[PDB]
Amino acid sequence: GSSGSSGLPYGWEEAYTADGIKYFINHVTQTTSWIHPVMS
């Protein structure tokens, strides 16, 4: 799988904090969680 991270499902959005860490947040559910919602 050439790619892995890039390619999240419609609705989710991976952002970063002022420190650098990365987290996953949804817009439809407006929920903050740390995971990789992706299936191959």
Curated annotation (Swiss-Prot):
Source organism lineage? Eukaryota, Metazoa, Chordata, Craniata, Vertebrata
Localization annotation: Cytoplasm
Domain of life, source organism: Eukaryota
Q: Where is the WW domain?
A: 8-39
Q: What does this protein do?
A: Plays a role in the translocation of transport vesicles from the cytoplasm to the plasma membrane. Inhibits the translocation of SLC2A4 from intracellular vesicles to the plasma membrane by STX4A binding and preventing the interaction between STX4A and VAMP2. Stimulation with insulin disrupts the interaction with STX4A, leading to increased levels of SLC2A4 at the plasma membrane. May also play a role in the regulation of insulin release by pancreatic beta cells after stimulation by glucose.
- Record note on quaternary structure: Interacts with STX4A.
Q: Mind telling me what this protein is named?
A: Syntaxin-binding protein 4
Q: Which residues of the full protein are shown?
A: 498 to 530 of 553
